[PDB]
Design a protein around this ligand. Structure first.
Ligand SMILES: C[C@@H]1COCCN1c1cc(C2(S(C)(=O)=O)CC2)nc(-c2cccc3[nH]ccc23)n1
Length: 137
């Protein structure tokens, strides 16, 4: 089923987040959205915030249908640290390690993720066509 495939795709991604990315030492700065009361200027500087809790929420909503779309948000965590903290900040070195262990684990699971991604896309295109042929009956 496409639902079955979406669940498996999302579970693989969630496991990368919880078992690999969140396990990077000293990764606490990236586990949750920045609290505006704690860092009042954060949202004046960072226009497109992202963090590992938000990624997990997006996974639970099946937002990510591709490896690329998942990695778009993973990379925002790193890019926002470069912007807010600087490219040589220890915060950014930590974010870089989060991104790198993500890549490493996506590589490990690329065959299964690619197959799920393709089959989800095929199924979605077929359901779209059938929905459209139906609406015109
Ligand atoms: C901005 C800074 C560097 O760039 C990445 C995210 N960083 C975070 C994140 C968090 C959160 S939190 C607790 O707001 O949920 C998301 C985890 N807090 C604090 C923080 C809060 C209060 C006093 C502080 N003094 C130094 C850092 C700091 N900095």
């Amino acid at each position: 089923s496409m639902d079955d495939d979406q669940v498996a795709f999302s579970f693989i991604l969630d496991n990368i987040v919880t078992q690999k990315m969140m396990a990077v030492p000293d990764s606490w700065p990236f586990h949750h959205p920045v609290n505006k009361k704690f860092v009042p200027d954060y949202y004046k500087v960072i226009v497109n915030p992202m963090d590992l809790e938000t990624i997990r929420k997006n996974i639970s909503k099946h937002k990510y249908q591709s490896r690329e779309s998942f990695l778009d948000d993973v990379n925002l965590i790193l890019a926002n640290s470069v912007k807010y903290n600087g490219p040589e900040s220890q915060y950014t070195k930590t974010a870089q390690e989060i991104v790198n262990v993500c890549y490493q684990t996506l590589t490990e699971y690329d065959e299964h993720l690619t197959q799920l991604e393709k089959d989800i896309c095929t199924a979605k295109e077929a359901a779209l066509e059938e929905a459209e042929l139906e609406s015109l009956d």
